Design a protein around this ligand. Structure first.
Ligand SMILES: [Mg+2]
Ligand SMILES: [Mg+2]
Lengths: 204, 235, 212, 231, 195, 240, 244, 222, 233
């Protein structure tokens, strides 16, 4: 019934020293029934990364929409969109559906190509921006993620240390949520290299 | 330039008067009304011998009790026929009965003056609407692009109209049989046609109370043409 | 209501009851549940009476416009789909319709389409619709063969309505029979269920439970 | 000349040529006569045929049980205006349970024709109408021009050669106004009036069209052998 | 309608769809084909609310056939599935949404690969080795999870499909009157007339 | 919106915009249609003023409306695309509602109706296009060939040509086409179609396109070499 | 009324020509020459900027060559402002197609769409046509490398090599003379620049008067790269080919 | 919440004879347990020898009758004063009713007159437009009290010929206008006794080839 | 769809030999609060018609303006506005009846019950009812709300059928109306003592009486009534 918890899933994003990390589980379900273990919830437009939790049809639709919009942005601006700008675009796009919204929990992550500053941001389904320094969480195990991140996180972690923190935050949160899990992916993002790691986890 | 719905100094609509000139260039169509039925006949006028003449459709069914013949820019008649058929069927749906021939004709003629700056110009085609109803019996109407329609005992429209009408003036009487009318249409068509009249370049049709509207086979018309030739050679 | 229609060697048999009720009150025993769309096409009435009446006489108008434009008899497939597409536009508004569009053409042969106010359109050999449909189905299924004669097929349709008329409280009055051929439908009379029941009981030996 | 291309253009002398050209179409139309007494009002119309095979164009149209008109000019325009009158008569009856006053019917026709003379794209109506009726203030006769001018009269005539009938009615004014409670004599005066507009042709059985409305007489049209009595 | 299954094997896609059509208390038909050929190498099966299912399927069919004529070219299964998803995603926020779930089985002639796409009425698309809609997956997925291999032959896929249908016939309360099975491969679409 | 009446009658009863649309057809490359006993062939001229053309991707003159019907044209190329698109949409719409593909006559009547509509609608000009529509009705083996023109009139033809120098090729067809015995085979029909174009074309190289349509949705376009063999055989018989 | 002032942009001449289309083509003939040459391993787009100034900021300037998507580019000849209206529409169509089918739009489908828009302005609306001719250079996995052109009539055609704008007659003859089917990109680059150098109305062809672009599969493995040449890069290729 | 519908009671009865037809209706108009009027005409002469009554919610009843009378008037204008046949009127009324399919005229309509062969005709409509020619039809409040009586006394249902004992039915002999009026009066007298909404007065409109005639009779006023 | 806020109670009326009488109290209630005591609910139209209105007062004021506007409009281009082409009761009623039914059909009714009383041009008595549903009916006596239940029975004892109208004088008719208003004051909890009465006679014309009061009331017997059963003191 509740659109934001039919399909399930989670996204988490964290900042480190000269790097950001964004991660998600791979589950898509129909309530109790597990349907897919390959449903990735993180997308990227140039160097800007977008995670989206919630109703899966809207996740897909919004990805296609932001690909559409960032492609036109690039053709006109003659440059790739930045995380700060994209965050405002996500916010504007969600709020234009104020009284018929997409049932999603987006999370932006990336490094500004000019300043080199790590950036993350989160939104509610309607567009309100949560620009946290430390971390952003989203999905059906957001409470669990808040608990994991709050205790595990410390500032200025190196890329390979941040990987361990965000991975352990996601995994243990997902294992306390029926509608999350079935695999996981972690992106480690530096100014000019991005590493993508699939995690091994319990498949129940 | 000038308005499409402009009046001339004589009190006529330029566009309506000009559309009447287009109808004069059209192929001949003749209608004759009798107490045994109404006969409709047309000149097909194929532009080339490779054109399959049976595909020339200048006589058309509107309902079982109403037929229609056309002359002029025949492409313009298609929407008029569509409207007529719709009007006939719609009235049957609303009233569980056949529609009067006059009422059908009036419905078609209401489209005529719906032009301005609605469609951009008047229709370039005249219609002979023939039919039968219980109230006024066998009827023949002439529907113009002016929106005016006259009832006729007999009427010719198209390029050979004034010559044919003068011939219809002498020949028509109130006691004509259906067979006599059929030959009379064929006689007058043959007179005004450029090419020699046969079953392939001319078409006949009729509307009777019993059988309704019927377009004549080329075999049926061919016999009537042969019957005509013999009776003219008979004196 | 009980309406049926089935395909067979000799074409289509259409059979319907005649009862109309408003709650427990029997409003009419002389209702016509076969709509004569045109001389070649028939439709059955179930669910909403007016919805079936109105839109199937409308369908007859659309079929007439088709054959005027195309100079050819409309197919049963095309006729049924005009009706189904129409009711589908109204879906949700509250139309009530369960009908069999029946016809016999050259290209198709004898054809029956079940059309529904939910937008359902099903081609089939035997259909039964109404409150007494289950009773009619029983007699049909156990006695139906493709190689039935026109006489026996007509009786089977009559007997199946009688079965429903007896058991179903909201079916009865009289039985209307039609036989659909390629050259058009043929009406096979109105048969009072009261008189038919006793006649069938005696001649057939059925309904031993009932005292006569 | 340069100011007759459309209805929206005044001439230098303040004339509207398109309206005047529409007025000219009435003069080309067949003659029709209107006259009334205190009890009845009568329309007499000379119908025109295309040729000997053709029917005679109908000139008179019924608008309500107590009102109707005769036309001269473009017949389709009369059909549009008569249809409009039928609706206005009908609106009055349905909404107010009230028969539409003949004078008010004239006001409505005036205003409808006026809008066609002041706007671009359209054209004036190409027909003149003679409206008769019997309402709460007795018998009435109106003359409608497509310029918008509507005039209440004892008698009048419009169409080709209408001046002859109009002069006759101007002489007979004191006689025919007094024809009360006698429909046949009032029609006779109308038939004698329209006869003054005839040349070469005479009034035959399928040529003549007569209509009448009065105190205890619904608007009824007489054609065919019903008018042989008056020939 | 009720049960629709799909399985992608080595060189083909197999779609199985129930034959029953129930309208309330009665089973009106036991030979209904719940599928439409969108293009020579693309088949779509469907299940959902009455009327909407066929209306939607035929609408998609017409659109793909229109594209095929315009471009003189067959769209890839992926392209067709994306088009279908968008239509359903458009539909879910409409005045009256299409209540239709579909499986799209296609053979990509460019890549020489079979492809099975599962799309629900919300516009939720997933590419799968095997899929289902409604309650069908609840009975069959444990068997498919166990036996399925990506290098299966068409004959092995049909045997695994029979086992799925047998389990459905045993544990489902509803009588779905068996299934019509169709195979989509490089040569096109064909029906297995004995199952 | 723009509502101007562009197509209007003149004092002599002519609609010049419709007649000037025919002059655009007269300028267009020649198209020819010939129906045999069990086939129809559509021949089309390609003007050789344009070389360095990419013939793979360049819009072909003959277009499939459905799997069983084809449409060729003479006149404005851009205008023809609008008629082709509308026709293709109507073909699918007909299949969807009537559950049967369009007859060739029906499809012709639709296209001709669209053309007619543009001759008395405000703010539009007529199509500068005449079409040849050919094919076979569903489950029918009788060949069909129709012609349409800007005015909106249409008719059936045993054989017909449209475009530039169509007067000449019509002259040829009128003396060479026998109604009592039409081209019995595909070869005879194609040969007569190529022969008729050779009266006008210039060189028989890449200037002639041929498309053969047969019953039951059997449509194929001949290649350069296949057509070149007809061109060779025709002139070798002519040297006598 | 208003009729008096209507030019009637969508009518036939007595000869059956569209006045405004013909006059728009006359306008385009005075625009800077644009050339497209298709090779087996890529496409070249070369175009001449019209009588420039020394104070024009060239490195940020764009009047001739525009990007529609990652696979398709266009060379413009005519009114730049009119072209940008159409270019933005084309960019949107490409994205609509990509959103719908999850595949990059085939070149011809995009070209047909823009050409149909141009056509509409000649048949209805009473507006003047777009005074623009495009050369479309693009790639897709069906037909590979493709060159098209469209003009204000809405008519489009496919080409191996083609010119638009000024001196097309002279340019097309020179291309027809030196073009061959087995030609490569580096050879086509040379042909394009040589053709412009001879047909130009300027005294000499220099880097500041040119815009240049290539669509190559010369991208790392099976994929396509668009290269809009920078002022310094145009200067280098002019020296390499031996024109300056 | 606003309820756009109401119940004005009343009962109507249409009977088709061999060469005549009657349409009767009580003249009482009510809401709940109150009498609005003891004489409020319910059956109307609509012209062209057609009589009509739309029983149930009186506002919709009056609206429908008004629109049908209007339709008769415009039928004359549009079709050269042609007489609207009873069958054509019936089809026209269907479309008037079905026009408001999703916000219906809350009435049970009956019309009566003569068909084109001069025989007696009665047509019966439901609120949404389904209609049908009938020999006998009571409508309104006391319809359930009247129809069974008419089945028995007009159509001779369940009546057999003495001596045969169920083997031979009573023959369906034609009833005169005087015989029908007796059955109408007794139907309404009985309905008045046992139904609270029926009473005050009975108005009968009789249609023949000669025209429309009216008859009025008193009913009990309690 | 709304709910009535400020409301007016019964309007009562009857025919007599030469015309009609109509009456209504001067109260505008606000639920159980007797808020406004000077509300005129009889609105004359010309010299031949009086429209009495009960129910929602804001809708009454709207209707009052429609009738005022109707008189203005009738006078336009009408030389006989004060003679042959003056507004009749039947015209005024049919107009209101049309409006009431249209408004109920848009599911936005004028929340009223209306009685149009008047005398026609030919001297005929006009008395007809219309309400928020567009329901209309005529009778020798008509009353709205509580009047229907309590006034009609009393007025029907004077004019029980059509034949009793010529036998009923204006004095007898007015007496019955005034007595009915007293009964309504005894028994209707939403009524007031102050009322208006209008007589429309074919001879003497329109007589409009304001500031009338219910008098000759019986209350003295109340002193003897004690307790609710057993109580004696
Ligand atoms: Mg689990
Ligand atoms: Mg009682």
């Amino acid at each position: 019934s509740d659109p934001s918890s039919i399909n399930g899933g989670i996204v988490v994003a964290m900042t480190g020293k000269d790097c950001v990390a964004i991660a998600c589980d791979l589950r898509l379900g129909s309530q109790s029934l597990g349907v897919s273990n390959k449903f990735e919830k993180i997308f990227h437009y140039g160097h800007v990364f977008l995670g989206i939790t919630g109703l899966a049809t809207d996740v897909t639709t919004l990805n296609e929409m932001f690909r559409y919009k960032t492609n036109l942005y690039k053709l006109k601006e003659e440059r790739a969109i930045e995380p700060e700008t994209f965050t405002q675009l996500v916010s504007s796009s969600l709020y234009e559906r104020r009284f018929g919204p997409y049932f999603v929990g987006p999370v932006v992550a990336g490094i500004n190509s000019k300043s080199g500053k790590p950036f993350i941001a989160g939104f509610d389904l309607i567009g309100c921006i949560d620009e946290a320094k430390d971390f952003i969480v989203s999905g059906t195990a957001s409470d669990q993620l808040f608990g994991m991140c709050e205790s595990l996180y410390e500032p200025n972690l190196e890329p390979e240390d941040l990987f361990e923190t965000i991975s352990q935050a996601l995994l243990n949160a997902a294992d306390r949520d029926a509608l999350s899990g079935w695999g996981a992916v972690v992106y480690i993002i530096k100014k000019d290299e991005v590493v993508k790691r699939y995690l091994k986890m319990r498949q129940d | 330039d000038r308005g499409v719905s402009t009046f001339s100094p004589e009190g006529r609509l330029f566009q309506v008067e000009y559309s009447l000139e287009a109808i004069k260039l059209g192929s001949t169509a003749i209608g004759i009304a009798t107490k045994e039925g109404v006969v409709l006949g047309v000149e097909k006028r194929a532009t080339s011998p490779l054109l399959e003449s049976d595909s020339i459709e200048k006589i058309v069914e509107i309902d079982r009790h109403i037929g229609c013949a056309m002359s002029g820019l025949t492409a313009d008649a298609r929407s008029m026929i569509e409207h007529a058929r719709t009007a006939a069927v719609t009235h049957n749906l609303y009233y569980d009965e056949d529609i009067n021939v006059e009422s059908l004709t009036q419905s078609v003629c209401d489209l005529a003056l719906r032009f301005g700056e609605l469609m951009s110009r008047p229709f370039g085609v005249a219609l002979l609407i023939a039919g039968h109803d219980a109230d006024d019996g066998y009827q023949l109407f002439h529907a113009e692009p002016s929106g005016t329609f006259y009832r006729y005992n007999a009427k010719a429209i198209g390029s050979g109209s004034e010559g044919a009408q003068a011939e219809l003036l002498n020949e028509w009487h109130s006691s004509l049989t259906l067979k006599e009318a059929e030959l009379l249409v064929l006689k007058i068509l043959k007179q005004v046609m450029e090419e020699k009249l046969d079953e392939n370049n001319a078409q006949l049709s009729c509307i009777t109370k019993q059988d309704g509207f019927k377009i004549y086979d080329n075999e049926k018309t061919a016999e009537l043409i042969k019957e005509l030739k013999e009776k003219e050679a008979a004196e | 209501t009980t309406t049926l229609a089935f395909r067979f060697q000799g074409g289509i048999i259409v059979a319907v009851d005649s009862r109309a009720t408003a709650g427990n009150w029997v409003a009419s025993q002389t209702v016509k549940k076969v709509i004569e769309i045109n001389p070649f096409l028939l439709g059955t009435m179930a669910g909403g009476a007016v919805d079936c009446q109105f839109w199937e006489t409308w369908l007859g108008s659309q079929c007439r416009l088709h054959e005027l434009r195309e100079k050819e008899r409309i197919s049963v497939a095309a006729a049924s789909k005009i009706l189904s597409n129409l009711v589908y536009q109204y879906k949700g508004a509250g139309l009530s319709m369960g009908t069999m569009i029946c016809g016999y053409t050259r290209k198709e042969g004898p054809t029956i389409y079940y059309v529904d106010s939910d937008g359902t359109r099903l081609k089939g050999d035997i259909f039964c619709v109404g409150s007494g449909q289950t009773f009619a189905y029983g007699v049909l299924d156990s006695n139906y063969k493709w190689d039935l004669s026109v006489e026996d097929a007509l009786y089977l349709g009559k007997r199946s309505i009688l079965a429903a008329a007896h058991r179903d409280a909201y079916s009865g009055g009289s039985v209307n029979l039609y036989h659909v051929t390629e050259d058009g439908w043929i009406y096979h009379g109105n048969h009072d269920v009261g008189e038919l029941f006793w006649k069938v009981k005696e001649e057939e030996g059925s309904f031993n439970n009932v005292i006569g | 000349n340069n100011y007759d291309g459309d209805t929206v253009t005044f001439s230098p002398t303040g004339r509207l040529f398109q309206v005047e050209y529409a007025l000219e179409a009435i003069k080309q139309g067949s003659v029709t006569v209107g006259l009334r007494s205190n009890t009845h009002a009568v329309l007499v119309a000379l119908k025109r045929n295309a040729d000997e095979l053709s029917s005679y164009q109908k000139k008179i149209i019924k608008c309500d049980e107590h009102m109707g008109l005769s036309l001269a000019g473009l017949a389709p325009d009369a059909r549009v205006l008569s249809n409009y009158l039928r609706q206005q008569c009908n609106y009055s009856s349905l909404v107010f349970n009230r028969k539409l006053a003949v004078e008010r019917a004239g006001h409505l026709l005036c205003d409808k024709a006026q809008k066609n003379t002041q706007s671009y794209g359209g054209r004036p109506y190409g027909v003149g109408l003679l409206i008769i009726g019997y309402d709460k203030s007795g018998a009435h006769l109106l003359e409608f021009q497509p310029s918008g001018n509507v005039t209440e009269l004892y008698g009048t005539a419009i169409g080709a050669r209408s001046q002859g009938a109009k002069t006759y009615l101007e002489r007979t004014l004191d006689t025919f106004i007094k024809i009360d409670g006698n429909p046949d004599e009032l029609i006779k005066a109308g038939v004698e009036a329209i006869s003054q507009s005839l040349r070469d042709e005479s009034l035959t059985v399928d040529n003549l069209s007569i209509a009448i409305v009065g105190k205890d007489t619904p608007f009824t049209i007489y054609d065919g052998e019903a008018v042989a009595k008056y020939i | 309608m009720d049960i629709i299954l799909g399985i992608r094997v080595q060189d083909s896609v197999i779609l199985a769809s129930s034959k029953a059509v129930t309208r309330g208390i009665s089973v009106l038909k036991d030979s209904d084909d719940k599928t439409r050929q969108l293009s020579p190498h693309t088949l779509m099966s469907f299940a959902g609310e009455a009327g909407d299912t066929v209306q939607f399927a035929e609408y998609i069919q017409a659109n793909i056939q229109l594209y095929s004529i315009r471009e003189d070219y067959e769209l890839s299964p992926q392209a067709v599935s994306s088009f279908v998803r968008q239509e359903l995603a458009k539909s879910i926020r409409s005045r009256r949404p299409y209540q239709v779930n579909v499986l799209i089985g296609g053979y990509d002639k460019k890549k020489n690969k079979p492809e099975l796409y599962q799309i629900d009425y919300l516009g939720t698309k997933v590419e799968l080795p095997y899929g289902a809609h409604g309650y069908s997956g609840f009975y069959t997925f444990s068997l498919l999870d166990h036996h399925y291999r990506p290098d299966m032959t068409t004959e092995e896929g049909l045997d695994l499909l029979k086992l799925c249908v047998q389990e459905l016939e045993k544990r489902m309360p509803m009588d779905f009157k068996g299934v019509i099975v169709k195979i989509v491969d490089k040569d096109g679409i064909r029906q297995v007339d004995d199952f | 919106g723009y509502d101007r009446a562009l197509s209007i009658f003149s004092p002599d009863g002519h609609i010049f915009q419709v007649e000037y649309a025919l002059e655009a057809v007269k300028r267009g490359t020649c198209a020819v249609g010939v129906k045999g006993k069990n086939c129809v062939v559509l021949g089309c001229e390609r003007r050789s003023t344009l070389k360095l053309q990419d013939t793979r991707i360049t819009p072909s003159k003959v277009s499939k409306i459905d799997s069983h019907v084809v449409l060729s044209f003479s006149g404005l190329n851009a205008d023809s695309r609008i008629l082709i698109e509308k026709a293709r949409v109507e073909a699918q719409s007909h299949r969807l509602t009537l559950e049967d593909p369009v007859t060739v006559e029906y499809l012709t009547r639709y296209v001709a109706g669209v053309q007619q509509r543009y001759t008395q609608s405000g703010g539009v000009r007529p199509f500068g296009v005449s079409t040849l529509i050919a094919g076979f009705d569903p489950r029918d083996d009788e060949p069909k060939l129709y012609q349409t023109e800007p005015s909106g009139i249409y008719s059936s033809w045993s054989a017909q040509t449209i475009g530039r120098n169509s007067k000449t090729v019509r002259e040829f067809l009128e003396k060479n086409y026998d109604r009592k015995e039409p081209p019995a085979t595909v070869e005879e029909c194609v040969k007569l179609t190529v022969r008729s174009l050779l009266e006008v074309v210039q060189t028989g190289a890449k200037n002639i396109e041929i498309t053969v349509v047969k019953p039951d949705s059997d449509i194929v376009a001949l290649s350069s070499e296949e057509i070149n063999q007809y061109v060779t055989q025709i002139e070798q018989e002519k040297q006598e | 009324g208003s009729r008096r002032y209507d030019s009637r942009t969508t009518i036939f001449s007595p000869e059956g020509r569209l006045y405004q289309v013909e006059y728009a083509l006359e306008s385009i003939s005075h625009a800077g020459t644009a050339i497209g040459i298709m090779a087996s391993d890529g496409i070249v787009l070369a175009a001449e900027r019209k009588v420039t100034s020394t104070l024009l900021e060239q490195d940020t300037s764009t009047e001739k060559l525009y990007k529609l998507n990652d696979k398709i580019a266009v060379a413009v000849a005519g009114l730049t402002a009119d072209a940008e209206i159409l270019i933005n529409t084309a960019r949107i169509h490409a994205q609509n197609y990509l959103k719908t089918y999850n595949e990059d739009i085939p070149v011809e489908i995009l070209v047909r769409r823009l050409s149909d828009i141009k056509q509409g302005y000649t048949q209805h609306g009473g507006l003047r046509p777009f005074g623009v001719s495009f050369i479309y250079a693009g790639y897709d996995d069906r037909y590979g490398y493709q060159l098209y052109t469209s003009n204000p009539s809405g008519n489009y055609t496919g080409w191996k090599a083609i010119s638009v704008g000024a001196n097309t007659s002279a340019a097309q003859t020179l291309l027809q003379m030196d073009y061959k089917d087995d030609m490569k990109v580096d050879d086509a680059i040379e042909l394009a620049l040589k053709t412009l150098s001879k047909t130009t109305d300027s005294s000499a062809l220099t880097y500041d008067r040119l815009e240049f672009a290539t669509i190559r599969k010369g991208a790392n493995d099976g994929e396509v790269y668009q290269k809009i040449f920078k002022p310094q890069e145009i200067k280098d290729i002019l020296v390499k080919t031996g024109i300056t | 919440q606003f309820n756009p519908y109401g119940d004005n009671g009343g009962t109507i009865l249409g009977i088709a004879g061999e060469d005549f037809a009657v349409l009767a209706g009580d003249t009482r108009n009510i809401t709940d347990y109150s009498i609005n009027s003891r004489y409020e005409p319910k059956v109307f002469d609509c012209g062209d020898n057609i009589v009509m009554s739309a029983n149930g919610f009186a506002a919709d009843g009056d609206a429908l009758v008004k629109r049908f009378k209007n339709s008769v008037k415009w039928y004359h204008f549009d079709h050269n004063d042609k007489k609207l046949s009873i069958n054509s009127a019936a089809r026209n009324i269907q479309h008037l009713l079905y026009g408001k399919r999703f916000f219906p005229y809350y009435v049970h309509t009956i019309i009566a007159g003569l068909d084109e062969d001069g025989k007696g005709a009665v047509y019966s409509f439901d609120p949404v437009g389904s209609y049908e020619r009938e020999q006998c039809r009571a409508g309104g409040a006391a319809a359930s009290l009247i129809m069974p009586f008419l089945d028995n006394q007009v159509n001779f249902k369940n009546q057999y010929e003495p001596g045969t004992n169920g083997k031979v039915k009573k023959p369906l002999k034609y009833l005169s206008v005087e015989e029908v009026i007796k059955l109408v009066r007794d139907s309404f007298t009985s309905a008045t006794e046992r139904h609270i909404q029926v009473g005050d007065g009975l108005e009968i409109l009789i249609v023949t080839k000669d025209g429309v005639r009216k008859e009025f009779y008193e009913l009990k006023r309690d | 769809t709304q709910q009535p806020i400020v409301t007016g109670t019964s309007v009562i009326s009857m025919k007599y030999d030469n015309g009609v009488i109509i009456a209504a109290d001067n109260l505008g209630s606000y639920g159980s609060l007797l808020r406004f005591n000077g509300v005129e609910r009889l609105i004359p139209v010309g010299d031949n018609t009086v429209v009495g209105i009960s129910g929602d007062i804001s809708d009454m004021q709207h209707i009052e303006r429609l009738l005022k506007d109707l008189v203005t409009e009738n006078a336009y281009d009408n030389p006989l506005a004060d003679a042959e082409e003056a507004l009749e009761p039947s015209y005024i009623f049919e107009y209101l009846a049309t409006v009431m039914y249209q408004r109920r059909s848009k599911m936005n009714p004028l929340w009223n019950a209306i009685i149009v009383a008047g005398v026609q041009s030919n001297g005929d008595q006009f008395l007809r009812y219309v309400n928020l549903l567009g329901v209309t009916y005529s009778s020798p006596t008509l009353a709205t709300g509580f009047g229907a239940h309590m006034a009609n029975p009393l007025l029907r004892k004077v004019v029980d059928r059509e034949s009793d109208i010529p036998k009923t004088t204006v004095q007898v008719a007015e007496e019955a109306i005034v007595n009915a208003m007293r009964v309504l004051y005894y028994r209707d909890a939403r009524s007031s003592r102050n009322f208006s009465l209008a007589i429309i006679d074919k001879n003497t014309g329109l007589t409009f009486k304001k500031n009338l009061q219910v008098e000759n009331m019986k209350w003295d017997f109340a002193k003897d009534i004690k307790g609710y059963g057993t109580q004696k003191i």
